Motif scaffolding. Structure first.
Motif, PDB file in Angstrom:
ATOM      1  N   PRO A   1      -9.210   8.793  -3.473  1.00  0.00           N
ATOM      2  CA  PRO A   1      -8.060   9.798  -3.215  1.00  0.00           C
ATOM      3  C   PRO A   1      -6.741  10.001  -4.295  1.00  0.00           C
ATOM      4  CG  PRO A   1      -7.474   8.359  -1.775  1.00  0.00           C
ATOM      5  CD  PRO A   1      -9.153   7.775  -1.607  1.00  0.00           C
ATOM      6  N   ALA A   2      -6.185  10.698  -4.012  1.00  0.00           N
ATOM      7  CA  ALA A   2      -4.698  10.381  -4.545  1.00  0.00           C
ATOM      8  C   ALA A   2      -3.995   9.322  -3.955  1.00  0.00           C
ATOM      9  CB  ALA A   2      -4.047  11.739  -5.001  1.00  0.00           C
ATOM     10  N   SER A   3      -3.592   9.909  -3.053  1.00  0.00           N
ATOM     11  CA  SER A   3      -2.771   8.461  -2.598  1.00  0.00           C
ATOM     12  C   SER A   3      -3.523   7.957  -1.162  1.00  0.00           C
ATOM     13  CB  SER A   3      -1.327   9.420  -2.680  1.00  0.00           C
ATOM     14  OG  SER A   3      -0.845   9.253  -0.944  1.00  0.00           O
ATOM     15  N   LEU A   4      -3.304   7.029  -1.055  1.00  0.00           N
ATOM     16  CA  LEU A   4      -4.025   6.285  -0.075  1.00  0.00           C
ATOM     17  C   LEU A   4      -3.140   5.646   0.791  1.00  0.00           C
ATOM     18  CD1 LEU A   4      -7.637   4.421   0.422  1.00  0.00           C
ATOM     19  CD2 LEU A   4      -5.886   3.168   0.250  1.00  0.00           C
TER      20      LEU A   4
ATOM     21  N   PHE B   1      -9.528   6.085 -18.536  1.00  0.00           N
ATOM     22  CA  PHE B   1      -9.457   5.292 -17.191  1.00  0.00           C
ATOM     23  C   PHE B   1      -9.332   6.526 -16.388  1.00  0.00           C
ATOM     24  CE2 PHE B   1      -7.845   1.524 -18.575  1.00  0.00           C
ATOM     25  CZ  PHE B   1      -7.507   1.057 -20.408  1.00  0.00           C
ATOM     26  N   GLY B   2      -9.244   6.234 -15.074  1.00  0.00           N
ATOM     27  CA  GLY B   2      -9.378   6.896 -13.308  1.00  0.00           C
ATOM     28  C   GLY B   2      -7.829   7.973 -13.700  1.00  0.00           C
ATOM     29  N   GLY B   3      -7.705   8.063 -12.433  1.00  0.00           N
ATOM     30  CA  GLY B   3      -6.681   8.531 -12.791  1.00  0.00           C
ATOM     31  C   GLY B   3      -5.579   8.131 -11.882  1.00  0.00           C
ATOM     32  N   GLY B   4      -5.568   7.417 -11.601  1.00  0.00           N
ATOM     33  CA  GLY B   4      -4.988   5.744 -10.482  1.00  0.00           C
ATOM     34  C   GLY B   4      -4.380   6.424  -9.374  1.00  0.00           C
ATOM     35  N   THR B   5      -4.688   5.564  -8.129  1.00  0.00           N
ATOM     36  CA  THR B   5      -4.434   6.006  -6.556  1.00  0.00           C
ATOM     37  C   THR B   5      -3.902   5.578  -5.883  1.00  0.00           C
ATOM     38  OG1 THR B   5      -7.180   5.638  -6.397  1.00  0.00           O
ATOM     39  CG2 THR B   5      -5.837   5.475  -4.346  1.00  0.00           C
ATOM     40  N   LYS B   6      -2.756   6.276  -5.409  1.00  0.00           N
ATOM     41  CA  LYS B   6      -1.197   5.326  -5.002  1.00  0.00           C
ATOM     42  C   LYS B   6      -1.072   4.721  -4.158  1.00  0.00           C
ATOM     43  CE  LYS B   6       2.690   4.346  -6.005  1.00  0.00           C
ATOM     44  NZ  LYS B   6       3.653   3.195  -6.836  1.00  0.00           N
ATOM     45  N   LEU B   7      -1.527   3.644  -4.021  1.00  0.00           N
ATOM     46  CA  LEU B   7      -1.666   2.607  -2.548  1.00  0.00           C
ATOM     47  C   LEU B   7      -0.141   2.677  -2.095  1.00  0.00           C
ATOM     48  CD1 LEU B   7      -3.951   0.324  -1.164  1.00  0.00           C
ATOM     49  CD2 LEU B   7      -1.524   0.317  -0.695  1.00  0.00           C
ATOM     50  N   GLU B   8      -0.042   2.992  -0.485  1.00  0.00           N
ATOM     51  CA  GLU B   8       1.383   2.459  -0.343  1.00  0.00           C
ATOM     52  C   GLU B   8       1.289   1.537   1.219  1.00  0.00           C
ATOM     53  OE1 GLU B   8       3.069   6.674   0.657  1.00  0.00           O
ATOM     54  OE2 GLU B   8       2.965   6.542   3.043  1.00  0.00           O
ATOM     55  N   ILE B   9       1.823   1.638   1.908  1.00  0.00           N
ATOM     56  CA  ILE B   9       2.353   1.248   3.049  1.00  0.00           C
ATOM     57  C   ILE B   9       2.972   1.194   4.042  1.00  0.00           C
ATOM     58  CG2 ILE B   9       2.621  -1.495   4.545  1.00  0.00           C
ATOM     59  CD1 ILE B   9       0.233  -1.117   2.470  1.00  0.00           C
ATOM     60  N   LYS B  10       1.951   1.494   5.872  1.00  0.00           N
ATOM     61  CA  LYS B  10       3.032   2.571   6.059  1.00  0.00           C
ATOM     62  C   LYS B  10       3.776   1.114   7.146  1.00  0.00           C
ATOM     63  CE  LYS B  10      -0.784   4.114   8.501  1.00  0.00           C
ATOM     64  NZ  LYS B  10      -1.328   5.572   8.517  1.00  0.00           N
TER      65      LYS B  10
END
Lengths: 421, 118, 111
Positions: free
Chosen positions: C8-11, C102-111
């Motif tokens: 997805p966009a951001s995970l 290149f792909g769009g890039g998945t902006k992983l984050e941490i909760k």
């Protein structure tokens, strides 16, 4: 011992072992090339097999005719040099194509990959012809003169030759696999060329030493005309039916080939169990060689073929039962295969001795080339059958077809034995 | 131990020329492909082209700017020259070394920013 | 030209859990025995980094929490377990035919 290190028999064993080591390493290299750059496509492997088989079918009589005229040392060294030079020149190309692998696979017009494929095939097809020629001349002519009137010596020679073949068949692929694992295919295909160069030199010197040792080797007692003459002279040989029976046993899928290993993989087996299965096959092969030796010593040369046929058919009864009766089926199939290896190897040993003991001294090369031609005709038919039937159930049919062909071959040998005795 | 390092000018004017140098310490430029990549302000990366290990060259046809990927084999350098720059050339330029054993951008450089204005 | 859609966009994820990111091609990016889909990790302020090459391999020195899998036109990268430092951007890039993308890039984050 100096005696058992200078006698002109250990030198033959040493040369044969070096040659077979190089041959099996090169075969493994080509198989790796196929599986890497083509995904072991069954169609292309079958086309390669058809090319080799047809090439030996049309040309075996000509090669045998050539062997029958010229001098022994000359033809042996020329065939050795051609084989090793072809193997080196193809190993270099395999190195180059392994290096620039992804370039070819992803940023080149397919015609260059196709050209590389057909080039590798065309070079392997000449290496195979040179190996066929050296096989004919050394096994069927040189082994029979270096041991004279005595008939047990010849049997022991054939037996230990087959044992060397059986050991190298399993030892050399493992060594090349290790070298390619802890290194790279670019290093394996260079070690192969270096090995073949040094081996060509050493085997040349060993052949010359053998030829210097036995003075009874220099005394040669001997378009389409020669082709047809050879085939018609092979038709009316006293051992035509036994040779045809031996030929028939090459139409089979019951072994370790491009299709049965894929079948096993489809049945969810592991690499290690396959390795120990190949080891058990080699063990049964050595058992078959020693069984042939003892049988030939006790009962006789001709009935050993019948005993071996009965043994092979007995185990193939389990092989065919394996189709109708999810582990019992595959276990029975592999058990039958590995057990019938004994009968197979002892039968072909006795047929080989029948060939190289009765036929006239001045026609060995020509009719042995025709024998190779018939073996490869049936092998070509085998590959054709594999092409039209790739499905797994089709394998359930191919097992039946193969046992039927083995039954035909042993019926023919039984007819031969009835004519003789 | 392979290392790359970029260099060039800070900014530029419209309709000018940029000559970004990439210096490679630890391995010659006659081994594996040498690629120019640029990340825009944002996230969309983009492939610009490459110079091969045998003088070959390739430019991205989807590029709307004249690019020349040259090389100088003496100082062990390869150059990207952008001609007729425009307000849509501002980006961050990275070098990369597409290898021949595993076929991926396995060694990058710290990259340099380029912005055009008046 | 081959277009790699990343989802997805951001995970967002939580520590100890398992995170899955996947990018789907538009053609076949797999040749004989090899699939050309690699995964890159880029933190803010540093150039990208090679994690996975040829869609199922592991680089020299990267933590073993990263796993690669897939073939054909659908691929997937898995992290298990995540950490507080894995908040980065992840790219998927193909090599099947020029020009690379290149792909769009998945902006992983941490909760």
């Amino acid at each position: 011992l100096a005696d058992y290190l200078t006698s002109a028999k250990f030198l033959l064993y040493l040369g044969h072992s070096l040659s077979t080591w190089g041959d099996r390493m090169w075969h493994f290299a080509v198989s790796v090339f196929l599986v890497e750059l083509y995904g072991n496509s069954l169609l292309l492997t079958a086309v390669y097999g058809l090319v080799v088989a047809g090439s030996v079918l049309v040309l075996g009589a000509i090669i045998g005719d050539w062997v029958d005229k010229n001098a022994r040392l000359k033809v042996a060294q020329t065939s050795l040099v051609v084989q090793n030079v072809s193997v080196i020149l193809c190993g270099i190309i395999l190195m180059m194509v392994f290096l620039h692998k992804h370039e070819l696979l992803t940023m080149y017009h397919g015609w260059v990959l196709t050209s590389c494929y057909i080039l590798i095939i065309t070079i392997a097809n000449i290496a195979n012809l040179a190996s066929t020629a050296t096989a004919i001349t050394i096994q069927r002519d040189w082994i029979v003169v270096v041991a004279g009137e005595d008939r047990s010596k010849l049997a022991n020679m054939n037996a230990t030759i087959r044992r060397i073949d059986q050991l190298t068949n399993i030892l050399a692929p493992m060594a090349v696999g290790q070298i390619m694992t802890f290194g790279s295919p670019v290093i394996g295909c260079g070690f192969i060329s270096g090995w073949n160069l040094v081996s060509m030199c050493v085997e040349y010197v060993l052949l010359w030493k053998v030829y210097q040792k036995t003075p009874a080797l220099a005394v040669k007692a001997g378009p389409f005309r020669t082709f047809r003459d050879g085939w018609v002279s092979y038709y009316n040989q006293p051992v035509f039916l036994a040779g045809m029976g031996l030929a028939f046993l090459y139409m089979t899928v019951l072994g370790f080939d491009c299709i049965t290993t894929g079948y096993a993989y489809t049945q969810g087996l592991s690499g290690s169990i396959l390795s120990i299965l190949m080891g058990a096959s080699a063990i049964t092969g050595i058992m078959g060689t020693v069984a042939f030796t003892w049988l030939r010593r006790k009962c006789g040369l001709v009935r050993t073929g019948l005993i071996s046929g009965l043994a092979q058919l007995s185990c193939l009864i389990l092989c065919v039962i394996s189709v109708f009766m999810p582990i019992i089926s595959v276990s029975l199939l592999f058990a039958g295969v590995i057990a019938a290896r004994i009968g197979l190897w002892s039968f072909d040993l006795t047929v080989t001795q029948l060939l190289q003991e009765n036929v006239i001294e001045s026609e060995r090369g020509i009719i042995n080339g025709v024998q190779n031609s018939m073996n490869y005709l049936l092998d070509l038919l085998h590959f054709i059958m594999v092409i039209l039937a790739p499905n797994p159930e089709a394998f359930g049919l191919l097992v039946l077809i193969s046992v039927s062909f083995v039954a035909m071959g042993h019926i023919m040998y039984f007819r031969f034995a009835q004519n003789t005795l | 131990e392979v290392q790359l390092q970029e260099s060039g000018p800070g900014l530029a004017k419209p309709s000018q020329t940029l000559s970004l140098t990439c210096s490679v310490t630890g391995s010659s430029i006659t081994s594996d492909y040498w690629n120019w990549i640029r990340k825009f302000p944002g996230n969309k990366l983009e492939y610009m082209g490459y110079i091969s290990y045998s003088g070959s060259t390739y430019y991205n046809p989807s590029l709307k700017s004249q690019i020349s990927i040259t090389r100088d084999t003496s100082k062990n350098h390869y150059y990207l020259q952008l001609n007729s720059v425009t307000t849509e050339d501002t980006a961050t330029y990275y070098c990369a070394r597409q290898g021949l054993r595993n076929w991926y951008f396995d060694v990058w450089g710290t990259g340099t920013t380029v912005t055009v204005s008046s | 030209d081959i277009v790699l859609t990343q989802s997805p966009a951001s995970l967002p994820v939580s520590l100890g859990q398992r995170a899955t990111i996947s990018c789907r091609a538009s053609k076949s990016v797999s040749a004989s025995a090899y699939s050309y889909m690699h995964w890159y990790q880029q933190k803010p302020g540093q150039p990208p980094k090679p994690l996975i090459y040829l869609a199922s391999n592991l680089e020299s020195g990267v933590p073993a929490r990263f796993s690669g899998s897939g073939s054909g036109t659908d691929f997937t990268l898995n992290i298990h377990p995540v950490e507080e430092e894995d908040a980065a951007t992840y790219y998927c890039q193909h090599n099947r035919e020029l020009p690379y993308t290149f792909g769009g890039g998945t902006k992983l984050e941490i909760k």
